[PDB]
Design an enzyme around this catalytic site. Structure first.
Site, short mmCIF file in Angstrom:
data_model
loop_
_atom_site.label_atom_id
_atom_site.label_comp_id
_atom_site.label_asym_id
_atom_site.label_seq_id
_atom_site.Cartn_x
_atom_site.Cartn_y
_atom_site.Cartn_z
N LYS A 164 1.08 14.89 1.01
CA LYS A 164 -0.25 15.17 0.49
C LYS A 164 -0.37 16.65 0.15
O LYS A 164 -1.24 17.07 -0.62
CB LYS A 164 -1.33 14.74 1.50
CG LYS A 164 -1.41 13.22 1.66
CD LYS A 164 -2.50 12.82 2.64
CE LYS A 164 -2.65 11.30 2.74
NZ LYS A 164 -3.19 10.71 1.48
N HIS B 271 0.78 -1.24 0.00
CA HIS B 271 0.00 0.00 0.00
C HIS B 271 0.81 1.28 0.00
O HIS B 271 0.23 2.36 0.09
CB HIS B 271 -0.93 0.04 1.22
CG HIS B 271 -2.04 -0.97 1.18
ND1 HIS B 271 -3.28 -0.68 0.64
CD2 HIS B 271 -2.11 -2.24 1.64
CE1 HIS B 271 -4.06 -1.74 0.78
NE2 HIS B 271 -3.38 -2.69 1.38
N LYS C 224 -8.14 14.86 4.42
CA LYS C 224 -7.35 13.64 4.45
C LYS C 224 -6.36 13.82 5.59
O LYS C 224 -6.25 14.91 6.16
CB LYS C 224 -6.60 13.51 3.12
CG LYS C 224 -5.81 14.77 2.77
CD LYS C 224 -5.10 14.72 1.43
CE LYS C 224 -6.05 14.88 0.26
NZ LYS C 224 -6.60 13.58 -0.21
N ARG C 225 -5.63 12.76 5.94
CA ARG C 225 -4.65 12.88 7.00
C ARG C 225 -3.61 13.94 6.62
O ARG C 225 -3.20 14.03 5.45
CB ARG C 225 -3.96 11.54 7.26
CG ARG C 225 -4.86 10.55 7.98
CD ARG C 225 -5.20 11.05 9.38
NE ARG C 225 -4.03 11.00 10.25
CZ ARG C 225 -3.71 9.94 10.98
NH1 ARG C 225 -4.48 8.86 10.95
NH2 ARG C 225 -2.61 9.95 11.72
N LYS D 11 -14.34 9.03 -3.81
CA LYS D 11 -15.56 9.41 -3.12
C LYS D 11 -16.15 10.70 -3.69
O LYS D 11 -17.35 10.77 -3.96
CB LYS D 11 -15.30 9.55 -1.62
CG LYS D 11 -14.87 8.25 -0.98
CD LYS D 11 -14.37 8.45 0.43
CE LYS D 11 -13.72 7.18 0.95
NZ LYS D 11 -13.23 7.47 2.28
N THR E 278 -8.44 7.20 -2.17
CA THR E 278 -9.80 6.70 -2.28
C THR E 278 -10.76 7.86 -2.06
O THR E 278 -11.88 7.85 -2.55
CB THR E 278 -10.09 5.59 -1.26
OG1 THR E 278 -9.74 6.05 0.06
CG2 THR E 278 -9.27 4.34 -1.59
C1 LIG Z 1 -11.85 7.88 2.49
C2 LIG Z 1 -11.20 8.36 3.64
C3 LIG Z 1 -9.79 8.53 3.70
C4 LIG Z 1 -8.83 8.28 2.51
O1 LIG Z 1 -8.45 9.53 1.90
P1 LIG Z 1 -7.24 9.86 0.84
O2 LIG Z 1 -7.62 11.21 0.37
O3 LIG Z 1 -7.37 8.79 -0.17
O4 LIG Z 1 -6.00 9.85 1.63
C5 LIG Z 1 -9.22 8.96 4.87
N1 LIG Z 1 -9.98 9.24 5.96
C6 LIG Z 1 -11.34 9.09 5.93
C7 LIG Z 1 -12.14 9.38 7.19
C8 LIG Z 1 -11.97 8.65 4.79
O5 LIG Z 1 -13.36 8.51 4.80
C1 LIG Z 2 0.42 2.76 4.24
C2 LIG Z 2 -0.88 3.39 3.82
O1 LIG Z 2 -1.63 3.82 4.68
N1 LIG Z 2 -1.14 3.44 2.48
C3 LIG Z 2 -2.34 4.08 1.94
O2 LIG Z 2 -3.16 3.01 1.41
C4 LIG Z 2 -4.38 3.38 0.72
C5 LIG Z 2 -5.14 2.09 0.35
O3 LIG Z 2 -4.40 1.27 -0.58
C6 LIG Z 2 -4.02 4.27 -0.53
O4 LIG Z 2 -5.20 4.70 -1.20
C7 LIG Z 2 -3.15 5.50 -0.09
O5 LIG Z 2 -2.69 6.22 -1.26
C8 LIG Z 2 -1.92 5.06 0.81
O6 LIG Z 2 -1.26 6.20 1.35
#
Ligand SMILES: *Cc1c(COP(=O)(O)O)cnc(C)c1O
Ligand SMILES: CC(=O)N[C@@H]1O[C@H](CO)[C@@H](O)[C@H](O)[C@H]1O
Ligand SMILES: O=C(N[C@@H](Cc1ccccc1)C(=O)N1CC(C(=O)O)C1)c1cc2cc(Cl)ccc2[nH]1
Ligand SMILES: O=C(N[C@@H](Cc1ccccc1)C(=O)N1CC(C(=O)O)C1)c1cc2cc(Cl)ccc2[nH]1
Ligand SMILES: O=C(N[C@@H](Cc1ccccc1)C(=O)N1CC(C(=O)O)C1)c1cc2cc(Cl)ccc2[nH]1
Ligand SMILES: *Cc1c(COP(=O)(O)O)cnc(C)c1O
Ligand SMILES: CC(=O)N[C@@H]1O[C@H](CO)[C@@H](O)[C@H](O)[C@H]1O
Ligand SMILES: Cn1c(=O)c2c(ncn2C)n(C)c1=O
Ligand SMILES: Cn1c(=O)c2c(ncn2C)n(C)c1=O
Ligand SMILES: Cn1c(=O)c2c(ncn2C)n(C)c1=O
Ligand SMILES: Cn1c(=O)c2c(ncn2C)n(C)c1=O
Lengths: 793, 77, 793, 69
Positions: free
Chosen positions: A538, A341, A532-533, A644, A640
């Site tokens: 990012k 990942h 996002k985190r 969304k 992901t």
């Molecule tokens: C979907 C989701 C994420 C994943 O976000 P990325 O923008 O793909 O890093 C992270 N946190 C929450 C609460 C989510 O619902």
């Molecule tokens: C180690 C880790 O948390 N990896 C995370 O995994 C998700 C699900 O595959 C990816 O969408 C994302 O880009 C990536 O940062």
């Protein structure tokens, strides 16, 4: 099933299960009574489903992960069981507001972000497709912490999510199991014996996973740590906390490796319990007996976190089941599949062999043997190349010896996959080149996906209904059906209805913002969102630069036409991640100056969305116009959240990275706002050498922003508060923020242009939504089922 | 009438005889759940410990305290 | 201090001070004995406090006002000294009811409404903050009249509040002073001499102002008029009444200017005495000597009423202290600060120069010179603009020459402030534009506040205790601490306890209503309250329309679910205010029809709360569910009653006017029932032209009400009784009642909806109370201390 | 105390509505705790509160063994 009977059941639970009446019942009480009422509808199919798996013995899939970012269960369950509308009516008839009751439910935030949410979407998909799938994790007493902002800074509070009880979990005491730690190894004439160990019990808790409208209910089994039962008496009893501390709290790190002994214990804990539970089940079914194991069992490793499963299985087959090494190893490789990942160096798991020797002596020996058989092969096929041995070893020697868990997963697995084309490619030809050259057919791609139930039907009913009224409800189980939406590209009315849906989502979410935050929201402004985190890769920082940019342009020429925006930035930062915390302070400092400057007024509002979590994502995502997916090219394995927003009617502005690349392919690049360096541009800039002080010298708008941030314009009381940020940007920025600044801003200007043309904007929105089908997690699991697990619906 | 006490996770220890001597084993009576108790979360309360005494004009104040919460559980009698 | 000793002191006073025993002691006697017992506890700190100010000489603040709406002193004093509980116990042990004794005390109603009550809250705050503040007013023999309703009409009775004696006041004969009137001016070679004047003596009475739990006791010095001592003998002695008539009675006008010579005498009387008392004190302290005056003295002008202080100070510095004009003027501007409390044309003070010439010859000359130096400047900076001279002159020429006291306050002051953001803004950029353009930094805002001691701790002990048990008693001195209350928004129990408090207040106040009025009160109904001085701008009329509205809906469909209400409207009308008196008759006429109609029953009760005063506000405010703050946008400078209701658990329904605007900002607009035109809507309607006959023609519900009122439905014996009201509404309504009618009613319907949802209603109540911190008068004074007076606690 | 206030309640009637039996000395701190609540929280004078306290509490001695005191 019908309204009248749902009202009776509700009242029956309020009474017998909550011991309350309408005069003394709390909101939590009503919520629990509703929860139990809905929960009863799953029991029949849950027992029936599990009984069916036993009688027909289809191949079983086990998704092993330290994380499951499940969010709330009530609404999701009502939708998948077809009860929402009925419950909504029943509750309303009882004088209550179902929406208020739903907010009582605590999020099951046993994840950090994508990795944990992916796993949750997969279970939903696997249940919807009718697979005999099981998810296995840890039942953390505390999940991802609850975030608060005090004085502009992130503050952490324990997320005591089980305090009031959890109706969706079912203790399974009869399946309790012992997990061992420490001790020493004994190579006797009756087999190897791992003795004088410390024992910790693992008590499993089952949570039902209902598929969408199919009568299938799978199980998510989460393990809990408990002290065994067999100096000061009081201290001894209190010391029982040590063992139980194993499943106490989720490590709050997203994409970062922390080599803490407790974490190593959690990894093995969940692994030892799971593998023993699967073996027991296997031996308890209709079945040397183990030769059929790989035909009945498939275990997916979610990242390297559960890497210890490989040697644990070997340990079991050899020391317990008495199988010879050669056979044990064969079955293991047929059983495991590994999903990589990430490619970020700091996220790579490398455990000091010293730590592993003390805690898991028998497993160190097995990992060493695995490496021996592994390197003997390489030496054979490449008698000269000794540097290849060093690069493919499971052990790293430089300084303090460490174990490369990823290498361990590759050799013990028969399949390895990235989570997006560009990521998988980088994983196969670059990071693991030496491995894919020998075993090419071992590496694959399995582009990520998100479930259209929670992320469409649940979070945006208005859009699901609009879509459904035009092309039927077929799309819920087959999202590629959204392509029929292209038939209405010139339908002016359907476009006005599409816009109304978004606006309603914006008006509602606006009420949430004026209620949680002081700020006055311009409901007509553009909802610019990046949630996002918090990470340097990012680039929430890049976004922040653009906001300050827009702010100055406004101060500069107040009378200059400016397309209004409500910039929303949210996400939790890992507690020990200093730069992430500083970035949060910067954003909050900017918003304070921006939201309170008379000259800007309703032109620009900035909000740091506090406590970003699944239930909050369900609110803001349907309300977004513009989705920020701007990580440096090659740094985001997939993403992901991006999917969304695409499914819910937002346009995207980002780089060709992660799944962003595939979104452009499906919808057409012109229908997205792509910008910045690409995988090749970043590499060139690297070989050459990134000198950030150049862009600062060549871009006045950026210089003004930088000077304001460096001289205290956003922190008068603390002139040098953002020093560390400036320092990293000019001398230690591996994510080249200044390098994509110019392209980003120019891209942002085009977005503003388009926003002023509703017909054009929504037309693009429709093409995006029409092209989102590919990203349903049902399609992802379908490819996993066919190419890795070899199982059918 | 109302009984008021503490909900111990571990009651009086289970006693076993090993080689003639008494051995104590933790009485984990709540491990599998107790259907006879009913949590009453709406009545949770804070309890204070430590801190110090401040003698002000508004009277005596107990400040700088560490707080612990009390969650009552009702059992029918 | 302890109970036993309080009982002895009480008995000691009943005996030696009231010359009574238990068999012959009256209720008044017990009250006086208790009053003296409590009063003794202040002496030590009062002498100590004043001695401290002399020894350390901190800058002194003098709040100069013709009004101090103090209410009762006993309970307030017991609370601020921490004696209430002890006294309550002692009295109870003596066989008495302290509550009954407290009702004996007459209100010290030396005010008309807000302006006078603000001053009273300020003293409390200034004493609580430990400031060296002094309040200066007139000791009216008669305060605001006592109101009675005879045959539906307001009837006035003298408020002979000193008749039985006042234990809280202390005559200070050694500080008596002469005040001059009339006479003529003599410009001699030894200075200007104001001679052949009529002398009136001013005898000061000091009343202690105890701060809340801090050992500080300041002073409120009120002046009394006395005839000097130096035709028919009998008549001559009787004629001594003329002079003494100066401090005889308070002018009963709220927001209205009456140019009566007696009033002009009261204005100068209080001003001449105060300024001479401050000068004497100044010269009696540790001190050309006057250069340090502005550093030791700050005088706040409560509205323009004490405007004469500016020239009086000049008179003193120049004619008495022999200072040159230039210096005198400098010190004056550094000494005075002006608070503008209104924008209503009819409230503006414009004294005919003829009247001022005869009564205050030397002051006319000084005002003329001030205007000369003032206009010479303008002429310099704007040689052309001669119309600007006319608009900024202290003298108005149109017809009979008059003096614009507000202009006089602006030039002689260094600070000018409105009493709320929207008011101050209107004062700075609109009403006094020409002045703020030259001196921008002179104008400020100082949003009003109310003291949480009298208006929470004293009037609603149940709520103060509930709050205190949850977040501590810290909030009494720092009301912004009420925000911690947000921590309990989902706490069902705290919400039930919050509601119980309100209900108890309603049950008790209900006993008061069934005791004072015939009417039967539905204790479960919603307490809809509008209590304030009767005014056309405050719109008690609009409220009345809504009541008749509700009444008809009930008659129309008796079986139609109706959320029960007890509408309470109270307030005194200025004696010569015809339209206010008529409005009172209308309300009383409506209640009579409403309260006695069998078809309406317990659905609706209407009460005209008689004799609205501070002690009565303390009873009804804690008992209110809904607070009416519906004056026309831009007409209410601020309002304070609105704040009182907010702090005590009531929701508000009003327009964006006065401080209502800031309440919405603090609590969030959604948590208040805002409606109607706003500052901009009213202006548009004005430019266009307000035609009230249009809304009457377009709204049937309003037409029915209007016809009933016009045709005699509410005055059968007098068919045209309300003709003048109807006439004003259709042709002379500057407050556009018909224009906000529709929005008001729709707003009222939403309130009824919410009331039926206790959880939702109280949740909002909690957010309001949690957001009331901003309105503590301690915060107001804090900003006054820092930005205008430059003094510290 | 919260139950007392939620019923048809100031504290004069407390001892007539509340009786607290102290099972041995283990809960002895209940005495000074009630005084604390009465005086520091409810602002009642000491004398009155001490009176309410003694009327509220009753103590049951369960042993005379020195090692158990
Ligand atoms: C979907 C989701 C994420 C994943 O976000 P990325 O923008 O793909 O890093 C992270 N946190 C929450 C609460 C989510 O619902
Ligand atoms: C180690 C880790 O948390 N990896 C995370 O995994 C998700 C699900 O595959 C990816 O969408 C994302 O880009 C990536 O940062
Ligand atoms: O615990 C009961 N109901 C349960 C109902 C419940 C179950 C699962 C999740 C939420 C609520 C309860 O109130 N809780 C379990 C939670 C916890 O683990 O703390 C809180 C219960 C009902 C009842 C009825 C009688 Cl007569 C006697 C004892 C009783 N207990
Ligand atoms: O926990 C459930 N029932 C409860 C029933 C129970 C309650 C009180 C005492 C003993 C048993 C349960 O099994 N336990 C509570 C104990 C604990 O907290 O460890 C064990 C439950 C029923 C159910 C039904 C569905 Cl469809 C999904 C999840 C479910 N959990
Ligand atoms: O006036 C006395 N006590 C005073 C006590 C008092 C003081 C201030 C306010 C209220 C009451 C008295 O009764 N009044 C002052 C009021 C007034 O101004 O009319 C009424 C008093 C006590 C006494 C005792 C003896 Cl032996 C002889 C004469 C006495 N006068
Ligand atoms: C507080 C108060 C006022 C001020 O009321 P507004 O509604 O602000 O006009 C007037 N009269 C009395 C007796 C008060 O207590
Ligand atoms: C002249 C006069 O009485 N003005 C009154 O002053 C008080 C106190 O500032 C305001 O709250 C109120 O709106 C206003 O009508
Ligand atoms: C992502 N991340 C973290 O999460 C982190 C960190 N240092 C500490 N933590 C927790 N660093 C440097 C980092 O990049
Ligand atoms: C809460 N907090 C932080 O979390 C922080 C900080 N400086 C750095 N960090 C990470 N400061 C000053 C601070 O108050
Ligand atoms: C407020 N007010 C008065 O108080 C008043 C009056 N006329 C006489 N009085 C006393 N008018 C017209 C008025 O508006
Ligand atoms: C007492 N009173 C009034 O005060 C009044 C009146 N008509 C007008 N006013 C003001 N009538 C008829 C009346 O009886």
């Amino acid at each position: 099933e019908n309204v009248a009977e749902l009202k009776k059941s509700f009242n029956r639970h309020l009474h017998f299960t909550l011991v309350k009446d309408r005069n003394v019942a709390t909101t939590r009480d009503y919520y629990f009574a509703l929860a139990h009422t809905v929960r009863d509808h799953l029991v029949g199919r849950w027992i029936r489903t599990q009984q069916h798996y036993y009688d027909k013995c289809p191949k079983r899939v086990y998704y092993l992960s330290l994380e499951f970012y499940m969010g709330r269960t009530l609404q999701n369950t009502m939708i998948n069981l077809g009860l929402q509308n009925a419950c909504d009516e029943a509750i309303y008839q009882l004088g209550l507001d179902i929406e208020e009751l739903e907010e009582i439910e605590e999020d099951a935030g046993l994840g950090n972000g994508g990795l944990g949410r992916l796993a949750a979407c997969f279970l939903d998909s696997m249940a919807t497709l009718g697979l005999a799938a099981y998810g296995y994790g840890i039942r953390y007493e505390y999940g991802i912490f609850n975030q608060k902002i005090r004085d502009g800074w992130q503050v952490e509070e324990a997320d005591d999510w089980l305090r009031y009880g959890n109706p969706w979990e079912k203790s399974r005491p009869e399946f309790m199991l012992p997990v061992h730690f420490y001790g020493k190894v004994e190579h006797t004439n009756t087999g190897t014996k791992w003795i004088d160990t410390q024992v910790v019990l693992a008590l499993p808790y089952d949570t039902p996973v209902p598929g969408y409208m199919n009568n299938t209910v799978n199980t998510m089994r989460l393990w809990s740590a408990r002290a065994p039962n067999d100096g000061d008496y009081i201290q001894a009893v209190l010391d029982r906390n040590l063992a139980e501390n194993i499943s106490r709290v989720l490590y709050p790190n997203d994409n970062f490796f922390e080599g803490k002994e407790l974490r190593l214990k959690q990894e093995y804990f969940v692994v030892a319990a799971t593998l023993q539970d699967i073996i027991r089940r296997f031996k308890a079914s209709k079945f040397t007996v183990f030769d059929a194991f790989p035909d009945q069992v498939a275990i997916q490793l979610n990242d390297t976190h559960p890497a210890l499963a490989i040697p644990e299985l070997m340990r079991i087959f050899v020391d317990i089941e008495k199988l010879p090494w050669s056979k044990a190893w064969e079955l293991t490789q047929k059983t495991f599949a590994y999903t990589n990942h990430t490619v970020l160096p700091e996220a790579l798991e490398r455990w000091p062999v010293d730590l592993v020797e003390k805690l898991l002596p028998r497993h160190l020996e097995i990992i060493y043997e695995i490496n021996q058989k592994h390197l003997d092969r390489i030496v054979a096929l490449f008698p000269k190349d000794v540097d290849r041995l060093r690069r493919m070893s499971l052990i790293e020697e430089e300084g303090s010896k460490r174990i490369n868990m990823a290498h361990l997963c590759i050799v013990g697995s028969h399949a390895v996959n990235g989570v997006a084309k560009i990521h998988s490619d980088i994983v196969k030809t670059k990071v693991f080149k030496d491995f894919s050259e020998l075993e090419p057919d071992k590496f694959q791609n399995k582009t990520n996906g998100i479930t259209p139930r929670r992320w469409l039907l649940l979070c945006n009913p208005g859009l699901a209904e609009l879509i459904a009224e035009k092309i039927g409800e077929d799309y819920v189980k087959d999202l590629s059906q959204l392509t029929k939406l292209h038939s209405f590209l010139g339908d002016d009315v359907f476009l006005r209805e599409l816009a109304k849906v978004k606006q309603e989502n914006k008006l509602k979410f606006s009420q949430f913002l004026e209620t949680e935050y002081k700020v006055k929201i311009n409901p007509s402004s553009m909802f610019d969102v990046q949630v996002k985190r918090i990470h340097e890769y990012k680039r929430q920082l890049l976004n922040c630069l653009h906001v300050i940019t827009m702010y100055n342009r406004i101060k500069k020429d107040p009378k200059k036409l400016f397309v209004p925006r409500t910039v929303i930035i949210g996400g939790k930062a890992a507690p020990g991640y200093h730069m992430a915390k500083m970035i949060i302070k910067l954003i909050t400092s900017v918003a304070d100056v921006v939201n309170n400057d008379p000259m800007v007024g309703s032109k620009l509002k900035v909000i740091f969305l506090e406590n970003y979590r699944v239930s909050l994502a369900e609110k803001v995502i349907p309300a977004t116009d513009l989705s920020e997916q701007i990580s440096t090219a090659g740094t985001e394995a997939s993403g992901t959240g991006n999917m969304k927003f695409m499914l819910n009617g937002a346009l995207t502005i980002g780089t060709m990275d992660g799944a962003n690349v595939e979104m452009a392919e499906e919808a057409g690049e012109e229908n997205l706002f792509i910008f910045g360096m690409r995988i090749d541009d970043v590499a060139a800039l690297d070989k050459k050498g990134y000198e950030a002080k150049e862009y600062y010298e060549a871009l006045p708008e950026l210089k003004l922003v930088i000077d304001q941030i460096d001289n205290g314009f956003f922190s008068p009381k603390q002139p040098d508060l953002f020093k560390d940020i400036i320092n990293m940007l000019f001398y230690h920025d591996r994510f080249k923020v200044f390098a994509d600044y110019e392209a980003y801003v120019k891209c942002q200007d085009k977005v503003s242009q388009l926003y002023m043309n509703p017909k054009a904007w929504n037309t693009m929105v429709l093409k995006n939504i029409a092209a989102s089908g590919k990203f349903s997690s049902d399609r992802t699991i379908k490819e996993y089922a066919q190419n890795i697990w070899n199982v059918e619906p």
